[PDB]
Structures are given as C-alpha cells and as structure tokens.
C-alpha cells in the first residue's frame, strides 16, 4: 500500500581497545545499521 518502515537491523561489534590487555579495560563499539522499507 505504502512505504512501511520496517525495524532497522543493528550490527554490534564490541572489541578490546588494546593490542594486549595493558591498562584499564576500554571497550570499542562498532555499529552497522541497515534500515528497511517496503
């Protein structure tokens, strides 16, 4: 009938911010968002 905004798909990747675990545990979030209509 019309453009239906289907719920977007998230893609989370959480990584450690360190080449070897030296220091405070800092975590890096990487996001890939895909929006869908119909």
């Amino acid at each position: 009938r019309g453009p239906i905004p289907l719920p977007t798909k998230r893609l989370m990747v959480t990584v450690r911010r360190a080449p070897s675990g030296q220091g405070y545990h800092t975590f890096d979030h990487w996001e890939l968002r895909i929006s869908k209509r119909l």
Binding site: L11, V13, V15, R16, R17, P19, D28, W30
Partner: peptide, 29 residues
Amino acid sequence: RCLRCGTREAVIRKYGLYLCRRCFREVAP
C-alpha cells in the same frame, strides 16, 4: 583464522566477519 593477516588469536566468528580483533579496529569503517 583471519582475513587480512593470519594471527589465529582473536579469531572472531561474529556473523561472517573473520578478523583478529586488532585488524578490525584499523579496518572497521
């Protein structure tokens, strides 16, 4: 193992992403 460099340490099998968890931060975008 990985994609851009064979490391095998932080293999990553999320979805279909094969990266070493340190290559991913440099290539993430």
